[PDB]
């Protein structure tokens, strides 16, 4: 499979225990051999700046795939900080685990195998999560809004929680984008960039929870 090839490429070309080389290996492979739905370096660079500004202690990612963004975020996390990433496809989840192991960030990241809708309500109980500092949304686009509402219902959002969403332009997340921008409960900022492995304009949306009205 493609995911297996990306992993093999990393194993044979990246420096173990070096997150940077791992990222560069994946980017090179996808740029030159096969396109893959990783956020990429262009947008990844914006992600890094946001992570550095907020220095989150607990981060939740929706959509791991092959672990590119998990490696990207975790390498910048402070000692004691945790990253929980959800992935419903067991095959992708396996690749991600191996990717994290090679990068040497396995102690910082916890992979949750399951659909976000089923896992979100169990976060407080099974993983000792109080409130989230940051959430990275990058799973199926039609899930952004329902999961954001679900996160709020479960009491996982505090005043100041940062939601960062990918693909708000391409493929697009119409309902979510309209909701956050129109809600008094969120303060939004848009970062223009480009779709991974091409000149299509895309962007990330930062929406900071202000609490309910
Ligand atoms: C765009 S790809 C992931 C990108 C990844 N963030 C990166 O940059 O490396 C997202 C994924 O989320 C999955 N995903 C979709 N719906 C999901 C859901 N409801 N809960 C969890 N995982 C889901 C797919 O199986 C796929 O691996
Ligand atoms: O089709 N695409 O170009 C993309 C890009 C992306 O960055 C995605 O996250 C995606 N998806 O989750 O389906 C699809
Ligand atoms: Mg994406």
UniProtKB/Swiss-Prot annotation:
The gene is Comt. S-adenosyl-L-methionine binds at residues 39, 61, 69, 87-88, 114-117, 138. Mg(2+) binds at residues 138, 166-167. Residues 1-213 are extracellular. Substrate binds at residues 141, 167, 196. It comes from the Eukaryota. It catalyses: a catechol + S-adenosyl-L-methionine = a guaiacol + S-adenosyl-L-homocysteine + H(+); 2-hydroxyestrone + S-adenosyl-L-methionine = 2-hydroxy-3-methoxy-estrone + S-adenosyl-L-homocysteine + H(+); 4-hydroxyestrone + S-adenosyl-L-methionine = 4-methoxyestrone + S-adenosyl-L-homocysteine + H(+); 2-hydroxyestrone + S-adenosyl-L-methionine = 2-methoxyestrone + S-adenosyl-L-homocysteine + H(+). Binds 1 Mg(2+) ion per subunit. The lineage of its organism: Eukaryota, Metazoa, Chordata, Craniata, Vertebrata. The modification Phosphoserine is found at residue 213. Belongs to the class I-like SAM-binding methyltransferase superfamily. Cation-dependent O-methyltransferase family. Keywords: Catecholamine metabolism, Cell membrane, Cytoplasm, Lipid metabolism, Magnesium, Membrane, Metal-binding, Methyltransferase, Neurotransmitter degradation, Phosphoprotein, S-adenosyl-L-methionine, Signal-anchor, Transferase, Transmembrane, Transmembrane helix. The keyword S-adenosyl-L-methionine applies. It is an enzyme of class 2 (transferase). Its cofactor is Mg(2+). This is Catechol O-methyltransferase. GO terms for cellular component: axon; cell body; cytosol; dendrite; dendritic spine; glutamatergic synapse; membrane; postsynapse. The chain holds residues 47 to 259 of 264 of the full protein. GO terms for biological process: artery development; behavioral fear response; catecholamine catabolic process; catecholamine metabolic process; cellular response to cocaine; cellular response to phosphate starvation; cerebellar cortex morphogenesis; cholesterol efflux. The keyword Iron does not apply. Its EC number is 2.1.1.6. Catalyzes the O-methylation, and thereby the inactivation, of catecholamine neurotransmitters and catechol hormones. Also shortens the biological half-lives of certain neuroactive drugs, like L-DOPA, alpha-methyl DOPA and isoproterenol. One of its GO terms (molecular function) is magnesium ion binding. Disulfide bonds: none annotated. The N-terminus is blocked.
């Amino acid at each position: 499979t493609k995911e297996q090839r990306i992993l093999r490429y990393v194993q044979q070309n990246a420096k173990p225990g070096d997150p940077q080389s791992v990222l560069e290996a994946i980017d090179t492979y996808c740029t030159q051999k096969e396109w893959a739905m990783n956020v990429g370096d262009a947008k990844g660079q914006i992600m890094d700046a946001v992570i550095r500004e907020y220095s989150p202690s607990l981060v939740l990612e929706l959509g791991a795939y092959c672990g590119y963004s998990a490696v990207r975020m975790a390498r910048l996390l402070q000692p004691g900080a945790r990253l929980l990433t959800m992935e419903m496809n067991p095959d992708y989840a396996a690749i991600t685990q191996q990717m994290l192991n090679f990068a040497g960030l396995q102690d910082k990241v916890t992979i949750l195998n399951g659909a976000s809708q089923d896992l979100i309500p169990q976060l407080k109980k099974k993983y000792d999560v109080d409130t989230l500092d940051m959430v990275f949304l990058d799973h199926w686009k039609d899930r952004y809004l329902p999961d954001t509402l679900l996160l709020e219902k479960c009491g996982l959002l505090r005043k100041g929680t940062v939601l960062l969403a990918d693909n708000v332009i391409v493929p697009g997340t119409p309902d979510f984008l309209a909701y956050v921008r129109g809600s008094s409960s969120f303060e939004c900022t848009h970062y223009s960039s480009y779709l991974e492995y091409m000149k299509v304009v895309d962007g990330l949306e930062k929406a900071i929870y202000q609490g309910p009205s």
